[PDB]
Every structure is written in C-alpha cells, then in structure tokens.
Amino acid sequence: SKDRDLSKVSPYENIPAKGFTHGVGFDYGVPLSLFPDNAIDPTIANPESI
C-alpha cells in the first residue's frame, strides 16, 4: 500500500509578502473571526447610487 512516490523536485523562494504596495490582488492576512471569509456589501447603505 505504501507505493513509491515519484513526482519531481521543484524550486521555490521564501518571500513572505510579495506585493502589498500594489493596488490589486490578494490580501493574504488571516481574519480574526469565525468563518474564513467575512464580507458585507458596501453598496447598499450608500447615500447615493453613483
């Protein structure tokens, strides 16, 4: 049952936070809350449509 693994060794780099100055793409941080994905919709309570 303990069959041999084969696969491939693969290269990597240890960069803890690749891009936080960027204005786009991925938070990374862990929310301090039950349920990994908190959310709410900002668009609903707004004083105006635009």
Binding site: G19, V24, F35, D37, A39, I40, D41, T43, S49, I50
Partner: protein
Amino acid sequence: DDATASQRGIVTQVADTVSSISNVVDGLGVPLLSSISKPIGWVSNVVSNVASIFGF
C-alpha cells in the same frame, strides 16, 4: 468569485464585470454602485442550510 480567484492562482484577473457608466462629461463617467457589487458567496449557504453550517 474569491474561490475561483484563488484557485486559478493568478493575481491579475480578480473576477471580471462590466459596470454601467453614467454622467459622462468628456469621455469619462461615474459607475453605479449597484453594478460594482460582487458576490459574497456564503449567504447562499446560510439561506439554503448546507450541512457544513452545522459542522457535519
């Protein structure tokens, strides 16, 4: 679409939509908040009562 956005693995695409621009002045305008809205995706589960809510 955060699930797909993380599964696909590329930074750029960040779930596409096309907003309804209005109040154009000179080829530039203001998007409606109503159409900038994006799916939340846990709400469907809470309303439909998926098993995972109860931990089983």
